[PDB]
Design a protein around this ligand. Sequence first.
Ligand code: HEM
Ligand SMILES: Cc1cc(N)nc(COC[C@H](N)[C@H](C)OCc2cc(C)cc(N)n2)c1
Ligand SMILES: [Cl-]
Length: 362
Amino acid sequence: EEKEILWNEAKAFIAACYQELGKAAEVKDRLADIKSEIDLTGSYVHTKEELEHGAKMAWRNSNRCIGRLFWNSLNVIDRRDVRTKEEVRDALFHHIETATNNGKIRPTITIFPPEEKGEKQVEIWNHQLIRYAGYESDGERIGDPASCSLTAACEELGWRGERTDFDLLPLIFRMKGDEQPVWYELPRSLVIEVPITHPDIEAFSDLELKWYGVPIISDMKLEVGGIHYNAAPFNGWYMGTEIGARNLADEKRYDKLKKVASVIGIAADYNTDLWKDQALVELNKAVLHSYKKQGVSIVDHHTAASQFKRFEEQAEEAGRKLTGDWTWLIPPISPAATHIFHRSYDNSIVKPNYFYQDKPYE
Ligand code: HEM
Ligand SMILES: Cc1cc(N)nc(COC[C@H](N)[C@H](C)OCc2cc(C)cc(N)n2)c1
Ligand SMILES: [Cl-]
């Protein structure tokens, strides 16, 4: 039954993958090999070629991602060979370094061994590999509130944060057979951070804002042809709005709009003044300016929408169905200035893909 669902996913994925790779003729024999392997072992092992194309297809199928034009240049690092916590730590360190590439960010995924009996081999607790800690002590809020529960779990495990607004969470993951995860502090030399300044308004630096260079999503499951890669962190570069319209602006995150309004010299008193709107624009301008000034890759929402239009045209030229989730594709500032806003998208889930999974803490 679980075997049968594996077999059906496998058939469907190998046919589609080999067709795209111009290897349709090899499908029958590879399917035959896979069927026997599943028969004997209850599973099968992807070739390097299948794994790489599988991760790329998965990105291509990610409905919520505006960045999919560049799906075929994903850098796929195959770490199915790891067995120890030191090898895992060093793989994650290497992912950070190679993905960061001195600011010229490379879209990269590192793939650790997959689940077996739905038993995880490696379980990553971090939401992103680089993320800030969050604290609340009777009314007192410090850092990123979205990290509050992970931070509390790390501090159970013997870690202690400095209670700055920008403490870097350690890497935290658990190996099969261990009851408790392990944690390792990130080497600062690997982590690029960007101070946020504004191109025209000198006082903007009085806010002492910064953000990290690379978003490396580390808690989603990569599913390829029935195989469950629960531990497979991946990164791109940011779209500016993700930092300037959510991470630094949202009231449940860093909540900086009133402070922004003050430093850009407008009143924050009347809804009709559109002070939040103006503050959002200047903060988003600041974020783009700052990343560019420091040599760290970033894209603005207009350029990203333009790139996505090319992605839509490319799907159509290749005779592939396009899927998308309009609610995430539209940027959260000036959405109607993009073509995305003015059309609709089929939100069907197609595999391979990246999926949410339950968190081991909370
Ligand atoms: C190369 C630069 C990249 C840019 C600029 C980009 C941009 C985005 C943006 C703007 C979102 C929407 C987030 C939001 O509204 O809060 C998104 C979501 C997503 N992206 Fe991309 N992305 C990039 C690379 C990738 C890569 C390499 C992968 C996987 C290999 C990927 C997989 C996803 C997934 C799975 C989501 C939805 C996440 C969720 O549901 O929580 N992205 N990305
Ligand atoms: C409910 C909700 C809606 C919405 N639009 N966004 C969120 C939270 O999104 C937080 C981040 N922006 C997401 C997880 O990042 C996606 C992402 C992944 C990758 C690989 C690159 C990139 N630039 N951005 C939550
Ligand atoms: Cl983020």
